[PDB]
Amino acid sequence: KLHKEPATLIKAIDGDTVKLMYKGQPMTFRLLLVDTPEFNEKYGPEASAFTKKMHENAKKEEVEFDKGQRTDKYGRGLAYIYADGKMVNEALVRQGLAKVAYVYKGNNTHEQLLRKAEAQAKKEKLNIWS
Ligand SMILES: Cc1cn([C@H]2C[C@H](OP(=O)(O)O)[C@@H](COP(=O)(O)O)O2)c(=O)[nH]c1=O
Numbered sequence: 521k522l523h524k525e526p527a528t529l530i531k532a533i534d535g536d537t538v539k540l541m542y543k544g545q546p547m548t549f550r551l552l553l554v555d556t557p558e559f560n561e562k563y564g565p566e567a568s569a570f571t572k573k574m575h576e577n578a579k580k581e582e583v584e585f586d587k588g589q590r591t592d593k594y595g596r597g598l599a600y601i602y603a604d605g606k607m608v609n610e611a612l613v614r615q616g617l618a619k620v621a622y623v624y625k626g627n628n629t630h631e632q633l634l635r636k637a638e639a640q641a642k643k644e645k646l647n648i649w650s
């Protein structure tokens with residue numbers, strides 16, 4: 521029911537935002553359903569590094585919008601972002617580098633997937649959960 525669409529990296533930003541070219545236009549994307557620590561907070565650097573590596577090493581980046589709001593109040597695109605088929609949002613949670621967060625009704629298709637990842641991260645006492 522959701523669809524992956526093409527994009528190309530313009531620039532890594534931090535754990536939960538990235539600059540991508542989408543339909544030929546530069547956009548800042550904010551990753552749905554997650555919150556990484558800000559760069560100055562604990563695990564912030566590690567979260568940014570993690571996403572910078574995923575995004576930059578990817579051959580193919582893709583954007584998947586949910587069923588709701590596609591842009592937030594700051595004009596950031598709201599999407600699930602995939603790096604060579606692997607969801608960055610979920611990877612962050614699974615590594616304990618983000619919390620599931622900002623779960624608004626109707627842009628929450630992958631909520632349960634991410635919560636499962638968070639439970640596994642917490643069980644493994646990874647990073648934020650250490
Ligand atoms: C993830 C997400 C954030 N936002 C807004 C809510 C928060 O508003 P406030 O700025 O007023 O706190 C902010 C959190 O983003 P950041 O975590 O990037 O700051 O982004 C949405 O509106 N929709 C979303 O899906």
Ligand SMILES: [Ca+2]
Nearest residue numbers: 536555556558
């Ligand atoms: Ca954040």
